[PDB]
Design a protein around this ligand. Structure first.
Ligand SMILES: [Br-]
Ligand SMILES: [Br-]
Ligand SMILES: [Br-]
Ligand SMILES: [Br-]
Ligand SMILES: [Br-]
Ligand SMILES: [Br-]
Ligand SMILES: [Br-]
Ligand SMILES: [Br-]
Ligand SMILES: [Br-]
Ligand SMILES: [Br-]
Ligand SMILES: [Br-]
Ligand SMILES: [Br-]
Lengths: 498, 498, 498
């Protein structure tokens, strides 16, 4: 007997088995890692049904589909049967789901080009809990790009990728969202990827959120790149863990108004020669809470390793960074010569007591020039404020008006209030204001042994005692000169000639 | 032959199939977008088994159940057959799962009332990877509310919503958690929703986390509201992407002790007439890292557009905001007349060089009054500190005690230490302290041409030279007056009469 | 007729059913909560196929497996049949998925030891949407540990746990990652757990991300512990919701360079006697945005309750914390006496106007000593800066050199620039510099009634009028003394002897 000739609940048993019951794999697929399953799999993927490909290793060549709804139940492995070229390509899927499956490459060489999964255009596709294995050569594990509309509303979550054949600057990465909008990329763990790291945003990518990204032994962990006039802008990148990258945790790129937040990077076992926290080339980006450690001046191979927690590249401008250089290597900030209006808050200085004691702590210090183009560095724990983009520091107790034409650009420090305003200095055993100039000349108004003293020279003073004003030494200091004489004066008893 | 008359593994094949085997849709369901599938689907959802509704479009009217365990395998669509009213209503589910499915509405008009999915009470329900389509009128895509115990332990994640028929203030949103506790809302992408935006927390909602929310062209992206005396409090809202909202990225509401963190908002393509970053009406809230851009004084239609990155509404008090007004429009902060004790840190000033040069930068500046009720604004990159809630600025190098009965409210600036304490001013070519008053009177203690000068008038001075104290001009300045004469003095040689 | 004698598409119907057709539970499993299903379930889990255990309660004793691929479809409950010992133990799974299922304990006593689910070694295992029920005694709901290699690449997400039999310090928790690397723990809701709370990282745990954790009525919510010489380090912990813990929201532990961010804690209904925000014992950790409320000096039972938003334990050093003590209890920061170089920014002071008015606000205040080991506390809204690790506060308008051998350690306040540098004080009715010392002696340089006055005693002064310098009173003050006389002087008219 055959199923076509049997009834179940009054209907064809064949049809029930073929169309209604859920199966572990498509009928006719072997899943034995050797039989060519391409045709059966391609047919299933091009249907409008949910496809299950599980409980086996399915050898299959390149496949194009207009539909993406595939689940591996955590046991399906799609193993690329070809040693070159792209594997799975989804063309402009309108909604879709690719989930709970492993995609394995079998590239011929370490320079073989090919993407593992491509969303060639797409809207509202969710790729979730996918493991990319045996990743090699040039290309990406998961890439979304315009075809020709921007990818929109993607959710890429729970992605693992494992790369091999690392080389500096090699053109590969784990996840690439090229020019996507309104998309989420969350919970990614990428190992040993080169130039484009764990997550790359590219081109006109905007209004995406990238979150919870771990990159281990990658060149960069997150990377913002472009081949066009506009770079990734208006993206949120939050929660980046950089386990021993080779160059930087985060490359913020040439774009603008990105918010990057909570970046932890360790270099303790890395072969990096030029270790970076975050770099930025564009404008008006926020880089909040970069915690970097494990840079002691030497890398894992005994080579010199420089440290830079934040680098402002080229004309980078109007950016903000808050940083924690929790390491002993000298380098902390690099302001390239053309960079302007960047503000860095060193929220904890590590073991440093002064960010200016070494000229190498802040490379590019000449760009801190007190003009409207100034870069600025603060280290509040050290009470250290270096530069102001207003050309001054000013405090006021309350909103108030100032008298016209009194304060000038010379008034670089302003302590303002209404009513009585007193600046109190002291609390100890002696208290003073020291006025001084670049030539080393110094003069004080001091409270010394309980009297005011006013400096008359490098060593001399007038002392305002309770009963008399006196010079520091006798018979040497005059009141007036022949060229600058008093009009006169008033004394109850004539001055005593000593 | 029939399956009742065939054996499989020790029982009839009929019973094996009927009792054990999983299917793509319930028996009797058409999934053809036209047949009324309400009866079969209602029966399934009212069972205690895990229900699968996939590979079709299932036309169905309103359904109620006390059980919620439904999976659509990414291919099932529940298509509301009625033109009005609520669709799916789950009454007090004790645990539940709604996953991998699309819920489509089919409302008669753009003002038709109806919720798509209601959790009318519930505990430990997970709603994940659900797409809400053709959303219109008033109501919500997904709403949880007390029935009448608080919803508790919900996990709502991976939600898409697409609204049409936007109108200002229309009473609709994507996800609403009314009075829930201990719940997670994560990874939401909502398009074109009106008043209640992508995620609303409402009423006594507390102890929830809302994370990774993208709202595109919504009126507001996240919204905290209430129809009672108590508003959402003690919630964490983190990672908000506001792609061109029409009024505000985040409405923090009238509640208290919410922590809102990492908010990116762009207005570059918005028709908003009044663009806002975050608004807050309540107390003791924290609003961290609001990055706002795309406001140059006009909207997408060429109409005037105001900007306000943080707005403190009504009696809003004791709030904190850290903000990045990366835009050229003049408005930045609004303190409404009853607002008190709000502290704003402008972490990067955009292109501004002075927060006080435009009277528009801080609207409500009179509320910065230096009292215990003062609002306060700092812009550290500009070295600019506006207001203090203590009525003073005070520094100390270490913990110390001060002598009783010395400092008073006049001492609005205090630079304190033990032992020797010196305030050094200068490092250039001239250095001074300028004392001045509101009437324009200015007097200096300066280091000028290498000597101390003490101002005796607007233009006059005493010069403390190394060998003599001299007046600025000869024969015009006296030592003593008829009514205030010295007691006497001591001079080695009698004064010379010139 | 048996299915072995029937054909479906040219293959045995028996084999097609048994191998390819999915079922709700393993053949032979009762799922009736009473029948011992151990044998059948153990066999299934030890196969290399994806296992489905759903639509029932499956009574089962302890099981060991080398494979982990199990899905409960939201309706399966694994109910531990034994009253002691471990339940499910997965031994070094290489990849794995445990999902959509409930695991229930049935321990004999409130001190019975046992783990619910153990990953005894493991790589690339994902545990998702699991509910742990009836959790009791000592041990954990989900534990991962080395066997013998660190767990690597775990994804633990969407976890609920409910503990019963809470007691202070009892050795139990929800999720424990012991010595894992490169792992993600996201979206956890844990109720009533004791010592180890919702999520513990332990031992050499490094390069993990923990996010979106809700703990209700737990002793601690997140906990970093160790039984060895090295403690959890280089981890990111972000988004912690502490709904009324009994001791602390976050225990940061003895390790280093962890970044903890966005912690919301409420004590309003807690019986805690000692309420804490975050504690830390190690070094170079960052604790960002701790918002704490609900501490008024008493607990929920009316007993005394202390408050500490940040506690620096033992030799804790070089840590940073930004905090919001939004409560009325007096305690805010505790620096234990051996703690050094910790910097706290109180970003909003709540209702406090002065962090020093109560000695209880900063416990351990002697550790703010102005040395290179100093702790430091800032409260910017109050304009209050307490301590500096450099021993000074210094501002400069731009990068510049200083001539050496001019400024010394006494110059504890430095206001620097090039060219003309003026410190302007005033804007009101009178303006002054008050120099003062610890004995209460005070002297001023003031602008008073439009003239400079220089104090000569507690009450006396010299007044620099436009036409004459005069003493405050007549016939009492001398110019010079017998031992300190002028050289001479120059006057156009002889001084008038009155
Ligand atoms: Br680039
Ligand atoms: Br270096
Ligand atoms: Br180091
Ligand atoms: Br140093
Ligand atoms: Br004032
Ligand atoms: Br049989
Ligand atoms: Br409201
Ligand atoms: Br603009
Ligand atoms: Br001192
Ligand atoms: Br000057
Ligand atoms: Br410990
Ligand atoms: Br200058």
């Amino acid at each position: 007997p055959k199923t076509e000739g049997i009834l179940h609940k009054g209907q064809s048993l064949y049809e029930y088995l073929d169309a209604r019951v859920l199966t572990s794999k498509p009928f006719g697929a072997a899943g034995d890692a050797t039989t060519d399953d391409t045709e059966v799999i391609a047919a299933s993927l091009n249907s409008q049904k949910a496809v299950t490909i599980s409980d086996g290793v399915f050898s299959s060549s390149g496949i194009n589909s207009n539909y993406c709804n595939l689940d591996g139940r955590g046991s399906g492995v799609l193993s690329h049967r070809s040693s070159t070229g792209n594997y799975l390509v989804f063309n402009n899927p309108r909604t879709g789901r690719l989930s709970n499956i492993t995609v394995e490459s079998n590239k011929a060489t370490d320079t073989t080009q090919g993407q593992q999964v491509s969303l060639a255009g797409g809207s509202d596709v969710t790729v979730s809990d996918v493991n990319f294995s045996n990743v090699k050569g040039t290309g990406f594990s998961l890439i979304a790009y315009p075809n020709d509309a921007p990818p929109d509303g993607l959710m890429i979550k729970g992605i693992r990728g494992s790369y091999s054949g690392y080389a500096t600057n090699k053109a590969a990465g784990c996840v690439l969202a090229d020019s996507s909008v309104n998309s989420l990329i969350d919970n990614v763990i990428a190992k040993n990827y080169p130039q484009f790291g764990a997550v790359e945003l590219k081109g006109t990518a905007s209004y995406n959120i990238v979150s919870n990204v771990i990159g281990a032994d990658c060149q960069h962990v997150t990377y913002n790149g472009t081949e066009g006039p506009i770079a990734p802008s208006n993206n949120l990148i939050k929660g980046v863990m950089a386990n021993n990258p080779k160059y930087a945790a985060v490359v913020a790129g040439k774009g603008s108004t990105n918010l990057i937040s909570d970046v932890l990077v360790d270099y303790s076992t890395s072969d990096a020669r030029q270790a970076h926290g975050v770099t930025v080339e564009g404008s008006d980006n926020v880089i909040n809470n970069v915690l970097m450690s494990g840079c002691d001046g030497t890398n894992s191979l005994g080579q010199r390793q420089t440290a830079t927690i934040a680098r402002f590249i080229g004309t980078a401008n109007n950016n903000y960074a808050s940083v924690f250089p929790s390491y002993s290597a000298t380098g902390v900030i690099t302001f390239e010569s053309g960079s302007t209006r960047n503000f860095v808050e060193v929220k904890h200085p590590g073991r440093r007591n002064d960010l200016l004691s070494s000229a190498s702590t802040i490379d590019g210090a000449a760009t801190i020039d007190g003009t409207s183009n100034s870069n600025v560095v603060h280290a509040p724990a050290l009470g250290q404020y270096i530069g102001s983009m207003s050309g001054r520091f000013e405090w006021r107790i309350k909103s108030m008006s100032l008298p016209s034409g009194v304060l000038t650009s010379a008034d670089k420090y302003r302590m303002l209030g209404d009513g009585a305003v007193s600046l109190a200095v002291g609390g100890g055993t002696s208290s003073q204001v020291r006025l001084f100039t670049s030539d080393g000349t110094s003069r004080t108004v001091s409270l010394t042994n309980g009297n005011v003293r006013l400096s008359t020279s490098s060593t001399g003073y007038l002392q305002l005692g309770a009963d008399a004003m006196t010079p520091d030494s006798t018979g040497t200091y005059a009141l007036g000169s022949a060229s600058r004489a008093w009009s006169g004066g008033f004394t109850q008893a004539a001055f005593t000639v000593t």
